[PDB]
Design a protein around this ligand. Structure first.
Ligand SMILES: CC(C)n1nc(C(F)F)cc1C(=O)Nc1ccc([C@H]2[C@@H](O)CCCc3cncn32)c(-c2ccccc2)c1
Ligand SMILES: [Zn+2]
Lengths: 213, 173, 139, 292, 135, 272, 98, 164
């Protein structure tokens, strides 16, 4: 676990070494969720000082997307090629989180790509990195994702989790109630039919016996 | 909904009647409301069964039947010409004015669903608006009105589980 | 004639057939059956012309069969209405398009029609049972 | 001591075989008990067979009026004598030295799509087997109806001796036999009787199945049975239409009341289809209707 | 997908007797790499044009069409070629089986999440709430 | 690293083998067997399993290879497509005896799997564990170790029906809606437990674990499942086809009832 | 017989050619077989008539569509047969009364 | 089939004008139908069912236009008003427009080229509306069968249906 190693090695470091470590973490391949590194008091102390830009960049990588780094580019320090590619991958993940059939136009507008070959190469890179799984449909100009990882969450996002899980539980409860009611109704119908048939047969037998006297 | 209730009340009032014959105002309201709801058969039979004395006494029934006859032949210019030729005092005015809007919507839907290229003059005649008004009206709809040739191109416009359980319980007895 | 019919050469085959028809009309056992036979033969060629094609230009068809486009259109309509040609004529551009039927929609339509007819028959039979039980007749 | 059924004593089996009570009575064996493993082995073998018939043997023992089946193995059959008996002897010799002490108690074969019954050939085979090697039982499995009805279709039969005429006493539950196998089911229906079938499992098997259900419910919740059997329903509809034609022909004139039998078959097929649909409706309600 | 540069370095590190080439050309390693690239691209795309397939295999589009047709003919791949549209279509991935597979994956996620919660934090929520739900 | 799929029939085979040997010999005894199945690309799928014969010399297990080859020919006579995959045994964690037996087995197949069942367990998880052999160099010596693989359960309809019938062991709508109830109950239980843990983390009763909450967020984002238009078209196709089948069945039943009524009416209200 | 031999090899090559495609241009086949478009169309017509090539020629745009798209149409045939039998059966049952 | 023999022996001969009318309305020819209707005017107006025959005359043209859709895919208005005998492109256009409005036909009119295109696609059976229609029809059949079963049970207990 690369993030565990970076947390362990950043126990007491602060200042320029902290910024170098943040740059290394952002550029390090394979690590795509920075939530353990963000919660450190040592990291959070960067707000007061001349290194607030690095903390803002870390927040952008953890929660933001690439378009956020189109209007807030002057403030943050310059990004290398690996950092920009990682930000594009995370933007693809963010897009796939909310919709499971991403049009090519949305990706071209978000990731700032010129032609379709570059965009498809980036999507293939993301698939190989195994952060998303999916297929590319060129005829319909779509990317159909079957599975994407979950990114970092703030303290104001757990409410959505509890709301969705509550809705799912209510749906399951309603399904169970409906199944039980239908089972009861079917059993009642069968019993009523059998009872009616037996009464008809008893009446027929009584009438037949009476006529034989 | 406000017209169907009035139609039902008029029908019941005519049916009860002081001896079969109803008053001319309810006759005119019934005829116009039959024209509204596209009940051409019912309107024709109502005109057939209206007493000739009432037709002679009240001359508005003639105009209402003229409008109905233009509707019966599907003559949209005739419908629009004959609608704006008579009036009453708040008895047929709302229904005769909703007739125009109903005919407008009907003609617009027919043009949309039955044509792929219709001349501007024919479209204006079907709707009743002037030609320039007819062309300029279809702007948000995007009907691709042409110039020179003046061609308008119309644009083409739970309980399930209980039901299944009932079906099975029927089949299996 | 037989070889040209087999080898999909219909202009020459029909020309030779029409050339020899006049001589064949003087026969004793074949003359009464000539005309009918000829029609049959011609019809075969038509369904044998459109068999490989999914959309055929009617000018080439008319040139092949030595007729005008209008007569070919009339013959094709007569064949489509009843015969073995399952096609539709696009007379704006004079093209014969092969028609592919939809099985699912056809089965749905036929099943719904059968259900409606069965319900009508059942209601009629219940009324018939009521009148028979009540002994209603005109004498 | 649920595992006591797994303990095998040879002395008692020799004593029972030498003191055969089944040679006096004829309706002696009326209970069949099958292990869980044996039943699963038969079901998997029959399913792997496909649309064809697969046959194998059945090892086990006897206990009073009970036929106990413990294991099974599949005969090659690409064959009556020769190859089949060579395989049987070789497999028994191989399996006797690893812990499998029981000997053959029956033979099983599949009847894919036409019920669980014994044909004329099966009755002759069972008569031949019971003539020489006794006791014996014939288990017939329908691997296709098992999927369609969600119920294991299995039947253990035993054949009456030639010349014996039992006096009626046949419940004979209704079986939807196809049209081309109705005549074969009619001539040979009173030459055999069915044994009531029960199943058993050990304690470790019970614990393992209980622990397996904690993760095996996913496959139940994502079955979608409406697609796994789409040719079987088509064949059923074809047979039902033929039966309807025959019942109509009977109506035009004038089995007994063939219309009732055709109606029963139609009801069975339709109910299976509706069950398959309501499962998917439940899945759609659970998973797709959580639209956020 | 093996790109051009990787194969370039691999050929750089190969010794000359390893590079077996036919007299007419058509290096065995290059052809095998092209076949591997096309098979691996069959698992990312639902369908692909000839121009993009030739740009991704780095071969002329006509050669890409020829190789794809040859590969489909011998049964190496599953797919078909629409020449007028210039599109090669791979496996279809129908709707209802996809729905079943997605349901299975979602339930797998639920099971794995419960396993991780129960094995990384016993007592606490896990067993207390299990018992409380049982009670 | 391969991906392994398991069939419940293999687990039943192993458990039955253990029970038989323990009951016969009078005390629990470790068993050793073999597995067969099919491998497609890099995905292994274990289908069946047959017992194997072995001996103990000094303190080591020696596998009888002649008997193994005899049984291999025997099973190849029937299951042509199935192939040897590895071996199985019963016990706890892997031990050097398992290493010795795996070294013996590797002479038969290049890369066998190693399945271990734990018949005496206390936890609430399936005790089946799957390992593969990895060779390594330590202090200049060539040793081998076991790397565990994650296994799933194979999906077969007949297998599912049989396992369900075995696990339960004792109208038609009521019978059908009992298999669905037992699975929706587990799904609801799991979702409720996850929701309670998430609510406890939100209000604060347990340490804030980021991994669990990120997995929960992904799980919440996974819904709805397949809300595309083509899926809806296919779903309505299925619904309409089943509706037509139900309509035809209803018509057949009504025709039969009509025939019965006509017969009774002709018997009563006629003379023929 | 050189003409017959040439036709045989051309037919075999065309049959092998059309194997993977779904819709294929006729000028493409003309380029591959080294014959003009008219002879390619004649060869295709002969092959389709002889039930050798399973496809149809689109003449207006000069292409060949191969019939590779098939589905489970037996269910609808079974439903049609069931419907016809039900129709006749209900007719007979109703006609039984009077 | 259960019809009495009076209609097939005695009632039919008196209705001889209407069988001639059907026979002419068996071969698509509006002129012949008009000639026959005008010839038998007294008979059709004596029985007071005049105006139900003019409906047959006006429906012959609709039947011909519908039969045109079974063969053609795009027909000129002048060409259409020559196989159905409508005497002019304008009358054919108004006939097609009225037919489209009433839902009898599935067609579109192109006044630019003066053509009429035939579509013939009522509905694909992939929507919940057809599901609702099927459910309603099945409910009607279920009620029908329930009534039939009630009548049979009421006839089973009859003492007269116990001695035979
Ligand atoms: C126990 C077996 C080996 N056996 N012992 C003796 C006796 F001669 F000793 C005799 C036998 C013996 O082969 N019986 C038999 C008979 C018929 C069939 C097939 C046969 O009709 C053709 C197929 C149709 C069918 C439907 N139902 C049985 N069949 C089979 C059989 C069953 C499954 C797979 C292959 C063959 C076995
Ligand atoms: Zn058999």
């Amino acid at each position: 676990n690369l993030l565990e190693q970076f947390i362990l090695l950043a126990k007491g470091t602060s200042g320029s070494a902290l910024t170098a470590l943040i740059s290394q973490v952002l550029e390090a391949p394979g690590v795509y969720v920075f939530g353990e590194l963000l919660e450190l008091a040592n990291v959070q102390e960067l707000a007061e000082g001349a290194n607030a830009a690095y903390l803002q960049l870390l927040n952008l990588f953890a929660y933001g997307t690439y378009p956020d780094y189109i209007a807030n580019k002057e403030s943050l320090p310059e990004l290398s090629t690996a950092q920009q590619n990682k930000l594009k991958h995370l933007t693809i993940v963010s897009l796939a989180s909310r919709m499971k059939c991403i049009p090519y136009s949305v990706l071209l507008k978000d990731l700032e790509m010129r032609n379709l070959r570059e965009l498809e190469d980036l999507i293939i890179e993301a698939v190989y990195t195994d952060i998303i799984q999916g297929k590319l449909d060129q005829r319909n100009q779509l990317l159909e994702v079957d599975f994407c990882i979950g990114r970092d969450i703030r303290k104001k996002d757990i409410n959505n989790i509890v709301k969705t899980l509550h809705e799912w539980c209510d749906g399951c409860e309603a399904v169970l109630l409906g199944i039980e009611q239908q089972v009861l109704r079917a059993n009642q119908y069968k019993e009523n039919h059998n009872r009616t048939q037996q009464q008809v047969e008893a009446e027929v037998t009584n009438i037949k016996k009476t006529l034989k006297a | 909904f406000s017209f169907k209730k009035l139609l039902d009340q008029c029908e019941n009032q005519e049916l009860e009647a002081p001896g079969g014959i109803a008053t001319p105002p309810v006759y005119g309201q019934l005829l116009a409301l039959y024209l509204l709801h596209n009940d051409m058969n019912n309107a024709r039979y109502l005109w057939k069964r209206i007493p000739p004395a009432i037709k002679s006494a009240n001359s508005e029934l003639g105009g209402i039947w003229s409008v109905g006859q233009r509707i019966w032949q599907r003559d949209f210019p005739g419908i629009y010409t004959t609608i704006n030729a008579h009036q009453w005092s708040e008895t047929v005015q709302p229904i005769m004015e909703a007739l125009r809007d109903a005919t407008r919507r009907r003609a617009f839907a027919l043009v949309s669903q039955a044509y792929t290229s219709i001349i501007a003059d024919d479209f204006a005649a079907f709707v009743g608006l002037p030609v320039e008004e007819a062309v300029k009206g279809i702007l948000e709809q995007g009907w691709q009105a042409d110039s020179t040739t003046r061609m308008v191109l119309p644009r083409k416009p739970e309980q399930q589980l209980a039901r299944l359980t009932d079906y099975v319980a029927f089949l299996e007895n | 004639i037989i070889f040209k019919f087999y080898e999909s050469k219909y202009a020459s085959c029909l020309k030779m057939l029409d050339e020899m028809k006049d001589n064949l009309l003087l026969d004793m056992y074949l003359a009464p059956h000539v005309r009918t036979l000829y029609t049959q033969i011609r019809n075969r060629a038509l369904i044998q012309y459109f068999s490989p094609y999914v959309s055929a230009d009617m000018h080439r068809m008319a040139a092949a069969f030595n007729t005008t486009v209008a007569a070919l259109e009339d013959e094709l309509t007569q064949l489509i209405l009843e015969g073995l040609i399952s096609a539709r004529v696009d007379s704006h551009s004079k093209i014969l398009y092969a028609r592919d039927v939809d099985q699912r929609s056809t089965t749905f339509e036929k099943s719904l029609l059968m259900g409606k007819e069965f319900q009508r028959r059942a209601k009629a039979m219940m009324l018939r049972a009521a009148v028979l039980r009540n002994q209603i007749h005109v004498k | 001591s649920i595992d006591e059924i797994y303990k095998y004593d040879k002395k008692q089996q020799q004593e029972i075989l030498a003191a055969k009570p089944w040679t006096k009575d004829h309706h002696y064996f009326k209970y069949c008990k099958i292990s869980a493993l044996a039943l699963l082995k038969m079901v998997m073998h029959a399913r792997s067979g496909g649309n064809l018939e697969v046959m194998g043997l059945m090892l086990g023992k006897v206990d009073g009026e009970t036929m106990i089946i413990m294991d099974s193995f599949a005969l090659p059959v690409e064959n009556a004598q020769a190859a089949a008996y060579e395989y049987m002897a070789a497999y028994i010799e191989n399996a006797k030295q690893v812990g499998r002490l029981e000997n053959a108690i029956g033979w099983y074969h599949s009847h894919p799509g036409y019920g669980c019954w014994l044909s004329g050939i099966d009755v002759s085979t069972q008569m031949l087997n019971q003539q020489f090697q006794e006791p014996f039982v014939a288990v017939v499995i329908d691997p296709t109806r098992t999927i369609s009805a969600g119920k294991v279709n299995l039947g253990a039969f035993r054949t009456y001796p030639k010349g014996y005429k039992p006096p009626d006493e046949g419940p004979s539950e209704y079986q939807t036999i196809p049209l081309n196998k109705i005549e074969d089911f009619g001539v040979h229906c009173k030459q055999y009787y069915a044994l009531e079938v029960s199943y058993f499992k050990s304690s470790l098997d019970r614990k393992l199945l209980e622990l397996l259900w904690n993760k095996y419910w996913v496959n139940t919740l994502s079955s979608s049975s409406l697609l796994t059997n789409a040719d079987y329903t088509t064949g059923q509809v074809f047979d039902l239409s033929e039966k309807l034609e025959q019942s109509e022909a009977q109506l035009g004139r004038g089995s007994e009341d063939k219309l009732a039998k055709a109606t029963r078959d139609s009801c069975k097929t339709t109910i299976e289809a509706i069950h398959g649909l309501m499962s998917q409706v439940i899945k759609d309600k659970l998973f797709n209707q959580i639209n956020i | 997908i093996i790109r051009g540069n990787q194969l370039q370095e691999f050929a750089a590190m190969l010794m000359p007797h390893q590079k077996a080439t036919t007299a007419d050309g058509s290096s065995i390693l290059d052809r095998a790499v092209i076949e591997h690239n096309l098979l691996s691209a069959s698992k990312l795309y639902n369908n692909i044009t000839f121009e993009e397939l030739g740009a991704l295999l780095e071969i002329p589009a006509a050669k890409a069409e020829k190789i794809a047709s040859q590969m489909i003919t011998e049964g190496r791949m599953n797919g078909f070629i629409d020449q007028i549209d210039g599109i090669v279509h791979f496996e279809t991935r129908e709707a209802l089986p996809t729905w079943d597979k997605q349901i299975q994956s979602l339930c797998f996620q639920v099971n794995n999440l419960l396993e991780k919660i129960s094995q990384t934090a016993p007592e606490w929520t896990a067993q207390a709430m299990e018992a409380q739900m049982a009670q | 690293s391969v991906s392994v799929a398991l069939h419940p029939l293999v687990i039943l085979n192993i458990s039955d083998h253990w029970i038989r040997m323990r009951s016969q010999e009078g005390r629990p005894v470790q068993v050793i067997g073999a597995l067969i199945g099919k491998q497609e690309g890099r995905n292994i799928e274990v289908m069946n399993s047959f017992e194997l014969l072995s001996h103990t010399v000094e303190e080591k297990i020696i596998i009888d290879k002649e008997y193994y080859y005899t049984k291999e020919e025997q099973f190849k006579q029937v299951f042509k497509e199935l192939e040897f995959l590895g071996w199985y045994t019963t016990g706890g964690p892997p031990d050097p005896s398992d290493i010795h037996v795996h070294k013996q087995v590797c002479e038969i197949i290049e890369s066998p799997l190693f399945l271990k069942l734990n018949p005496m367990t206390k936890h609430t998880d399936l005790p089946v564990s799957v390992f593969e052999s990895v060779i390594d160099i330590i202090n200049g010596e060539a040793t081998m170790l076991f790397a565990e693989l994650t296994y799933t359960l194979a999906t077969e309809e007949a297998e599912r029906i049989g396992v369900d019938h075995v696990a339960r062991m004792t109208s038609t709508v009521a019978e059908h809606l009992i298999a669905q109830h037992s699975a929706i109950k587990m799904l609801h239980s799991r979702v409720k437990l996850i929701l309670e843990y998430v609510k406890a983390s939100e209000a604060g009763e347990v340490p804030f674990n980021h991994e669990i909450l990120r997995e929960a967020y992904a799980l919440c984002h996974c819904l709805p499942v397949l809300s595309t238009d083509k899926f809806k078209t296919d779903f309505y196709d299925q619904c309409n086809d089943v509706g037509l089948m139900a309509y035809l069945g209803t018509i057949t039943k009504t025709c039969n009832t009509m025939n019965q009524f006509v017969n009774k009416f002709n018997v009563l209200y006629d003379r023929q | 017989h050189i003409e017959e031999l040439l036709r045989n090899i051309r037919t075999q090559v065309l049959i092998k050619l059309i194997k993977p495609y779904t819709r294929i241009h006729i000028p493409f086949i003309s380029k591959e077989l080294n014959i003009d478009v008219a002879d390619v169309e004649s060869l295709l017509v002969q092959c389709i008539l002889d039930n050798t090539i399973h496809g149809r020629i689109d003449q207006v745009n000069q292409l060949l569509e191969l019939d590779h798209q098939k589905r489970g149409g037996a269910r609808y045939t079974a439903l049609d047969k069931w419907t016809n039998q039900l129709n006749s059966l209900n007719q007979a049952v109703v006609s039984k009364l009077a | 089939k259960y019809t009495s023999q009076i209609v097939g022996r005695f009632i039919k001969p008196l209705s001889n004008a209407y069988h001639e009318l059907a026979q002419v309305y068996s071969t698509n020819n509006p002129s012949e139908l008009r000639n026959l209707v005008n010839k038998h005017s007294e008979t059709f107006t004596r029985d007071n069912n005049m105006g139900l025959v003019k409906q047959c005359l006006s429906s012959l043209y609709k039947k011909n236009i519908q039969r045109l859709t079974k063969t053609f895919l795009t027909l000129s208005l002048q060409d259409m008003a020559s196989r159905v005998q409508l005497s002019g492109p304008q009358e054919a256009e108004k006939y097609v427009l009225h037919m489209i409005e009433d839902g009898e036909i599935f067609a579109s009119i192109n006044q630019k080229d003066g053509m009429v295109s035939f579509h013939d696609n009522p509905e694909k059976y992939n929507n919940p509306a057809m599901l609702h229609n099927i459910d309603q029809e099945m409910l009607k059949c279920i009620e029908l069968d329930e009534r039939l079963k009630a009548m049979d049970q009421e006839i089973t207990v009859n003492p007269q249906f116990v001695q035979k």
